[PDB]
Design an enzyme around this catalytic site. Structure first.
Site, mmCIF file in Angstrom:
data_model
loop_
_atom_site.group_PDB
_atom_site.id
_atom_site.type_symbol
_atom_site.label_atom_id
_atom_site.label_comp_id
_atom_site.label_asym_id
_atom_site.label_seq_id
_atom_site.Cartn_x
_atom_site.Cartn_y
_atom_site.Cartn_z
ATOM 1 N N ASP A 160 0.817 -1.233 0.000
ATOM 2 C CA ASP A 160 0.000 0.000 0.000
ATOM 3 C C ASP A 160 0.830 1.253 0.000
ATOM 4 O O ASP A 160 0.583 2.212 0.733
ATOM 5 C CB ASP A 160 -1.022 -0.036 1.172
ATOM 6 C CG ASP A 160 -2.197 0.936 0.982
ATOM 7 O OD1 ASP A 160 -2.348 1.601 -0.065
ATOM 8 O OD2 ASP A 160 -2.987 1.040 1.927
ATOM 9 N N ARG A 164 -0.184 9.084 1.155
ATOM 10 C CA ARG A 164 -0.928 8.983 2.420
ATOM 11 C C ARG A 164 -0.273 8.052 3.454
ATOM 12 O O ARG A 164 -0.604 8.121 4.639
ATOM 13 C CB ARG A 164 -2.382 8.555 2.179
ATOM 14 C CG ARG A 164 -2.535 7.121 1.658
ATOM 15 C CD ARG A 164 -3.982 6.693 1.366
ATOM 16 N NE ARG A 164 -3.917 5.386 0.694
ATOM 17 C CZ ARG A 164 -3.759 5.190 -0.608
ATOM 18 N NH1 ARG A 164 -3.744 6.197 -1.465
ATOM 19 N NH2 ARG A 164 -3.649 3.955 -1.080
ATOM 20 N N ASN A 165 0.610 7.167 3.014
ATOM 21 C CA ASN A 165 1.375 6.284 3.896
ATOM 22 C C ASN A 165 2.865 6.681 4.009
ATOM 23 O O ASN A 165 3.710 5.832 4.298
ATOM 24 C CB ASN A 165 1.195 4.843 3.405
ATOM 25 C CG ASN A 165 -0.062 4.199 3.926
ATOM 26 O OD1 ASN A 165 -0.574 4.583 4.974
ATOM 27 N ND2 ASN A 165 -0.557 3.186 3.215
ATOM 28 N N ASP A 178 2.419 2.413 7.395
ATOM 29 C CA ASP A 178 1.162 1.794 6.945
ATOM 30 C C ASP A 178 0.117 2.046 8.028
ATOM 31 O O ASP A 178 0.176 1.453 9.080
ATOM 32 C CB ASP A 178 1.412 0.296 6.704
ATOM 33 C CG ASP A 178 0.210 -0.429 6.069
ATOM 34 O OD1 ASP A 178 -0.404 0.102 5.143
ATOM 35 O OD2 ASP A 178 -0.124 -1.540 6.507
HETATM 36 C C1 LIG Z 1 1.023 14.348 13.021
HETATM 37 N N1 LIG Z 1 1.602 13.018 13.081
HETATM 38 C C2 LIG Z 1 0.847 11.917 12.910
HETATM 39 O O1 LIG Z 1 -0.351 11.964 12.686
HETATM 40 C C3 LIG Z 1 1.488 10.582 13.014
HETATM 41 C C4 LIG Z 1 0.721 9.404 12.891
HETATM 42 C C5 LIG Z 1 1.381 8.177 12.983
HETATM 43 O O2 LIG Z 1 0.523 7.105 12.839
HETATM 44 C C6 LIG Z 1 0.995 5.826 12.596
HETATM 45 C C7 LIG Z 1 1.238 4.963 13.632
HETATM 46 C C8 LIG Z 1 1.590 3.632 13.429
HETATM 47 C C9 LIG Z 1 1.701 3.150 12.139
HETATM 48 N N2 LIG Z 1 2.156 1.878 11.941
HETATM 49 C C10 LIG Z 1 2.848 1.460 10.865
HETATM 50 O O3 LIG Z 1 3.370 2.192 10.055
HETATM 51 N N3 LIG Z 1 2.942 0.105 10.759
HETATM 52 C C11 LIG Z 1 3.611 -0.606 9.766
HETATM 53 C C12 LIG Z 1 3.199 -1.919 9.476
HETATM 54 C C13 LIG Z 1 3.744 -2.683 8.439
HETATM 55 C C14 LIG Z 1 4.772 -2.118 7.662
HETATM 56 CL CL1 LIG Z 1 5.518 -3.010 6.318
HETATM 57 C C15 LIG Z 1 5.221 -0.758 7.970
HETATM 58 C C16 LIG Z 1 6.322 -0.102 7.152
HETATM 59 F F1 LIG Z 1 7.388 -0.834 7.238
HETATM 60 F F2 LIG Z 1 5.968 0.047 5.912
HETATM 61 F F3 LIG Z 1 6.673 1.047 7.603
HETATM 62 C C17 LIG Z 1 4.626 -0.060 8.993
HETATM 63 C C18 LIG Z 1 1.451 4.040 11.125
HETATM 64 C C19 LIG Z 1 1.108 5.371 11.316
HETATM 65 C C20 LIG Z 1 2.754 8.095 13.250
HETATM 66 C C21 LIG Z 1 3.448 9.308 13.318
HETATM 67 N N4 LIG Z 1 2.820 10.495 13.202
#
Ligand SMILES: CNC(=O)c1cc(Oc2ccc(NC(=O)Nc3ccc(Cl)c(C(F)(F)F)c3)cc2)ccn1
Length: 298
Positions: A160, A164-165, A178
């Protein structure tokens, strides 16, 4: 594939729930959410730190809990990289909800952010102090390619990849993430009903048609992410209904036109990532080298 064989090292990762002060939501889906929090001493001894906490919400089932535990394990497996959202700890003890604690990234997701800077952009640079430039855009592209090259080296695929990610932290550092279950994929127009709600505009032909996900289909998505970056956060395939005929034209070889802020070379890179044969797309390693060169030329 979900890391169910490799253990959880509690002495390394476990963080007490009562040292975490939960604050305002950062994102909500149907079953998952991310919440801002202050964590006391999560990485530096006795130092308060703002963090982002991913957890379930009311309505979640044990199946989503299993998914969140697998996400914790995947993040432990992947390990640390500047351009991957940094895992800081977890709350996994019985008697409370599962919580996955990662670094807070000041500026949030890259799509929204870039979309707010259209009036604060010049291609080449005090009135312009906080402006984006062509250099920032290639730099963000480079950093995402480095992050994905790292993910590929850990034998992982994203599935994905999209602006947005991507998170933007301080000092123009971008981090791949993600949101998964912490995004309401029913109400988000980027995910279209097929059979599942899927990011069709970011998906490679083989993924749409054959449900094949590899690192090379992530390269396709990366190409779309480039388009998002060099459009300053525009929605892909402008003016196109995302239906059966879209999926056929894509297979026939239809592609997006150059976005507003692109260079010729960057557009050719988008076209390279959207080669119909997965094996003829560049690798993330070749993308790193290439974008590094474009950063020099800039
Ligand atoms: C203003 N700031 C915010 O709103 C904000 C929001 C956040 O929210 C998040 C919190 C946790 C996650 N969890 C992941 O990302 N899980 C993940 C799982 C598999 C895989 Cl493969 C991956 C990878 F490797 F691709 F990275 C990542 C994502 C977003 C973080 C920081 N800041």
């Amino acid at each position: 594939e979900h890391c169910e064989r490799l253990p959880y090292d509690a002495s390394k990762w476990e963080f007490p729930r009562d040292r975490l002060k939960l604050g305002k939501p950062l994102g909500r889906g149907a079953f998952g959410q991310v919440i801002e929090a202050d964590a006391f001493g999560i990485d530096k001894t006795a130092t308060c730190r703002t963090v982002a906490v991913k957890m379930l919400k009311e309505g979640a089932t044990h199946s989503e809990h299993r998914a969140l535990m697998s996400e914790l394990k995947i993040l432990i497996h992947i390990g640390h990289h500047l351009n991957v959202v940094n895992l800081l700890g977890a709350c996994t003890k019985p008697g409370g909800p599962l919580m996955v604690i990662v670094e807070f990234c000041k500026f949030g997701n890259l799509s929204t952010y870039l979309r707010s800077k259209r009036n604060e952009f010049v291609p080449y640079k005090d009135l312009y102090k906080d402006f984006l430039t062509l250099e920032h855009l290639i730099c963000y592209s480079f950093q995402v390619a480095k992050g994905m090259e790292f993910l590929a080296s850990r034998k992982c695929i994203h599935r994905d990849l999209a602006a947005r990610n991507i998170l933007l932290s301080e000092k123009n550092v971008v981090k791949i993430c993600d949101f998964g279950l912490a995004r309401d994929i029913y109400k988000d127009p980027d995910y279209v009903r097929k059979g599942a709600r899927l990011p069709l505009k970011w998906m490679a032909p083989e993924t749409i048609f054959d449900r094949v996900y590899t690192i090379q289909s992530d390269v396709w998505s990366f190409g779309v992410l480039l388009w998002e970056i060099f459009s300053l956060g525009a929605s892909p395939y402008p003016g196109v209904k995302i239906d059966e005929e879209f999926c056929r034209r894509l297979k026939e070889g239809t592609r997006m036109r150059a976005p507003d802020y692109t260079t010729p070379e960057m557009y050719q890179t988008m076209l390279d990532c959207w080669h119909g044969e997965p094996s003829q797309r560049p690798t993330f390693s070749e993308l790193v080298e290439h974008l590094g060169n474009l950063l020099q030329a800039n």
